[PDB]
Structure formats: C-alpha cells, structure tokens
Amino acid sequence: PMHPFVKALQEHFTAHQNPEKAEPMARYMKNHFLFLGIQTPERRQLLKDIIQIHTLPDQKDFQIIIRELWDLPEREFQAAALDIMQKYKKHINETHIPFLEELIVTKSWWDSVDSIVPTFLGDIFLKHPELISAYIPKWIASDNIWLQRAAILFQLKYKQKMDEELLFWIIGQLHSSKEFFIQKAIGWVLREYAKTNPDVVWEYVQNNELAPLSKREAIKHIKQNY
DNA sequence: TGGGGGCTT
DNA sequence: AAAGCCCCCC
C-alpha cells in the first residue's frame, strides 16, 4: 500500500477483521478468496473513518489507489475499491474503459464484475454509443468469461432504453457457452428485461436455443402468466 | 424448484 | 426504516 490512503485503509480493515465471519463469507464465493470477515455496513464505515481522516484523494490518484487495493489478498479490499470508484463516478469516462477491463479480468468473480458492469459500463455506453462496436464484439470473442458476462450485462438496468436487437444478438453469440456464469448472465438479463417487456422475452425463450438453465432462470417470474 | 442473511431503498 | 428482493446460493 505505497499510497498513504491505501496503507491507512489496510491497517484499519486489518485491525477490525472478524475470523468468525471470514469463513462463511469465503464459502459464499466458493473459496476463491481470503476474507477478513467484514460485511458491507462495517466495510463502508471503516472506509468512511479513513476518508474522514485523510479526505478523499485527488482524482489524479484514483486509479493508483484502486489498483493497489486490487492487488491486496483479502476480498474486502476489492469491495472497498469499488465503493471508492463509486465516489469518483463523476470523473470516470470513456478513457477509463481499458482500466475497467483490467478490473474485470483480474481477481475475477461475479461479485466484482457485476459491480463494475451494469453501472459504470452501462452509463459509459449510454453516453458514448459509438464505443459499443469497439468493445462488445471484442469481449464476446475474447473467450474471457467475465468480459463475455460484461457484454451480456452492460444493458442490465436499461429498462425501456434496452436495445432489443443488440441484446438478442449478444445472447445469440453466447447461447452455446458451457460456462455456468454465462448461462446465468443470459438468464438474469432476460429475467430483468422481462420486468419491462415480458412478451418479447417469453417469445425469445420459447423460440430460440439456450441452455435449459438459462431458460429456467429467464422465465422464473413470468411463467405463471402464460 | 423457488425462496432465503444480507443488502437496498 | 420497515419491508422487498436475491446478483448469488442450495
């Protein structure tokens, strides 16, 4: 934690770790990560304490801090890094897409990736429509399952802004994936979109090839209506 | 299947 | 802030 802010945060988090909570938190993530055992309320308070002391670092340092936290072993530091990224949301723009790509493909799991994609990337592509073709096809073809999940979920919260043709194209490109988290992402985005346009999702699921898992996930809340 | 402490609003 | 939702999990 070269940067003083990251050092303080690490010291403060470590001083407040809870071994009894570490185990179940770690199991939730299929043991891919060590945990300190600090849940979100306390994790955010501990971040608040440090901000109260140091003040939020200048925007020129924000990528440095986030990377340094990403390199720390315990998962809470990546969670804290995302809390921090949210506080800098107004300074995050299209020039940061490569930075966000690195975050997605490093220490990858659903918890970090879902926290990056629908909000930060979703907003970026809304403001910069021309960049969709520069990133989405590349992510789909990358064979990195987390970039693939990113391509599927960037429109997750769009509601009526959903580009249906694009969504169905992206899903079509990944419908044969044998990856659990891709099949789940397809199910999720379809299920979420069905809150807005259930008819189109129902017809899509009935008439197109998807894993049974994705079909089950997609229709779990609307099947009682058909 | 379909619903649940941890999270959100 | 009482109450709904659930990425995920099983």
TrEMBL record:
Keyword list (alphabetical) reads: Calcium, Metal-binding
Q: Which residues form a coiled coil?
A: none
Q: Sorted alphabetically, which InterPro entries does this protein's record hold? A: ARM-type_fold, DNA_alkylation
Q: Does the keyword Metal-binding apply?
A: yes
Report residues binding Ca(2+): 143
Record flagged with keyword Cell division: no
Under the heading Gene3D superfamilies, the entry gives: 1.25.10.90
List the transmembrane segments.
Answer: none
Q: Which Pfam families match?
A: DNA_alkylation (PF08713)
- Write down the superkingdom of origin: Bacteria
A single GO molecular-function term is: metal ion binding
Query: What is this protein's name?
Result: DNA alkylation repair protein
